[PDB]
Design a protein around this motif. Structure first.
Motif, short mmCIF file in Angstrom:
data_model
loop_
_atom_site.label_atom_id
_atom_site.label_comp_id
_atom_site.label_asym_id
_atom_site.label_seq_id
_atom_site.Cartn_x
_atom_site.Cartn_y
_atom_site.Cartn_z
N UNK A 72 -5.47 15.25 -5.76
CA UNK A 72 -4.40 14.46 -6.36
C UNK A 72 -4.90 13.04 -6.53
N UNK A 73 -4.70 12.46 -7.71
CA UNK A 73 -5.20 11.11 -7.99
C UNK A 73 -4.12 10.22 -8.58
N UNK A 74 -3.85 9.10 -7.92
CA UNK A 74 -3.04 8.02 -8.47
C UNK A 74 -3.97 6.97 -9.03
N UNK A 75 -3.44 6.19 -9.96
CA UNK A 75 -4.19 5.06 -10.49
C UNK A 75 -3.49 3.76 -10.15
N UNK A 76 -4.21 2.88 -9.48
CA UNK A 76 -3.74 1.53 -9.19
C UNK A 76 -4.40 0.58 -10.18
N UNK A 77 -3.61 -0.24 -10.87
CA UNK A 77 -4.14 -1.19 -11.85
C UNK A 77 -3.90 -2.59 -11.33
N UNK A 78 -4.96 -3.40 -11.30
CA UNK A 78 -4.84 -4.71 -10.71
C UNK A 78 -5.75 -5.67 -11.43
N UNK A 79 -5.14 -6.70 -11.95
CA UNK A 79 -5.94 -7.74 -12.66
C UNK A 79 -6.21 -9.14 -11.76
N UNK B 253 -8.82 -7.67 -1.52
CA UNK B 253 -8.93 -6.32 -1.00
C UNK B 253 -7.75 -5.53 -1.60
N UNK B 254 -7.99 -4.30 -2.00
CA UNK B 254 -6.93 -3.42 -2.48
C UNK B 254 -6.79 -2.24 -1.49
N UNK B 255 -5.65 -2.14 -0.84
CA UNK B 255 -5.39 -1.10 0.16
C UNK B 255 -4.49 -0.02 -0.46
N UNK B 256 -4.75 1.22 -0.11
CA UNK B 256 -3.88 2.33 -0.45
C UNK B 256 -3.12 2.72 0.81
N UNK C 189 -12.92 -2.01 -14.20
CA UNK C 189 -12.77 -3.02 -13.19
C UNK C 189 -11.30 -3.27 -12.88
N UNK C 190 -10.42 -2.96 -13.79
CA UNK C 190 -9.00 -3.11 -13.62
C UNK C 190 -8.31 -1.94 -12.95
N UNK C 191 -8.83 -0.76 -13.18
CA UNK C 191 -8.21 0.44 -12.69
C UNK C 191 -8.98 0.99 -11.52
N UNK C 192 -8.24 1.56 -10.59
CA UNK C 192 -8.81 2.14 -9.38
C UNK C 192 -8.21 3.53 -9.17
N UNK C 193 -9.05 4.50 -8.85
CA UNK C 193 -8.51 5.83 -8.49
C UNK C 193 -8.29 5.90 -6.99
N UNK C 194 -7.10 6.34 -6.63
CA UNK C 194 -6.71 6.61 -5.23
C UNK C 194 -6.55 8.10 -5.12
N UNK C 195 -7.52 8.77 -4.49
CA UNK C 195 -7.52 10.24 -4.52
C UNK C 195 -7.39 10.88 -3.13
N UNK C 196 -6.73 12.03 -3.12
CA UNK C 196 -6.71 12.93 -1.97
C UNK C 196 -7.47 14.19 -2.34
N UNK C 197 -8.37 14.66 -1.49
CA UNK C 197 -8.94 15.97 -1.74
C UNK C 197 -8.21 17.01 -0.92
N UNK C 198 -8.13 18.22 -1.47
CA UNK C 198 -7.52 19.35 -0.79
C UNK C 198 -6.15 18.97 -0.22
N UNK C 199 -5.24 18.64 -1.12
CA UNK C 199 -3.90 18.22 -0.74
C UNK C 199 -3.19 19.35 -0.01
N UNK C 200 -2.47 18.96 1.02
CA UNK C 200 -1.69 19.87 1.84
C UNK C 200 -0.21 19.62 1.63
N UNK C 201 0.63 20.57 2.02
CA UNK C 201 2.07 20.37 1.92
C UNK C 201 2.45 19.09 2.64
#
Ligand code: CL
Ligand code: CL
Length: 116
Positions: A19-26, A33-36, A72-84
């Protein structure tokens, strides 16, 4: 500093998938620092991963990744093997490290992980 944005507002995936969210930060010129974070269900906001990869503490093996995309503006925040159990709400938070230290949060997004 303007707050980051976090998309899509609702992400639905099947258990076992990534599962991948995209964080956009200018950014400003200044260091940041960008924290998820996972925000629910909660003890407090739980930091999952960061950009840059943290070098103040030892590395930690993780299903969670933050990558800066080549624009440089966009960042992928990903989970591998997502669980319930990964179902819940998430956000990204930008921390300016100068001139004034402050944090600005995105709106939340929801991850829904469905049964196979
Ligand atoms: Cl947002
Ligand atoms: Cl890095």
């Amino acid at each position: 500093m303007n707050p980051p944005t976090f998309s899509p507002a609702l992400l639905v995936v099947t258990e076992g998938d990534n599962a991948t969210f995209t964080c956009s930060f200018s950014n400003t010129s200044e260091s940041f620092v960008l924290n998820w974070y996972r925000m629910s269900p909660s003890n407090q906001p739980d930091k999952l991963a960061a950009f840059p990869e943290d070098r103040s503490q030892p590395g930690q093996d993780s299903r969670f990744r933050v990558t800066q995309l080549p624009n440089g503006r966009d960042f992928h925040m990903s989970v591998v093997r997502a669980r319930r159990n990964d179902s819940g709400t998430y956000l990204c938070g930008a921390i300016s490290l100068a001139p004034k230290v402050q944090i600005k949060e995105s709106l939340r997004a929801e991850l829904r992980v469905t049964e196979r």
